[PDB]
Nucleic acid binder design. Sequence first.
DNA 1: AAGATCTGAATTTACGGGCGCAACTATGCCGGACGTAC
Length: 49
Amino acid sequence: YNGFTGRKITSQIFIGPTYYQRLKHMVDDKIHSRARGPIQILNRQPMEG
DNA sequence: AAGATCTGAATTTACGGGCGCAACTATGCCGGACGTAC
């Protein structure tokens, strides 16, 4: 049944238990942004550190 | 004619390159020589 309108969904859905795994790659560990900050000492360009 | 030379044309080593970026980790350069204290 459609959770919003409560109407029956026309086609019948394949549903059941399944084993799922959460992988270690969270979004908070891979989100970053820069405006300006720690440039290099030699190239005078942005660097990771 | 013969040759030696000799000068342009077939075969062997030898550098030098070898995906975009992300992310994370973990590891790194002494031995004699001279003094001082006990």
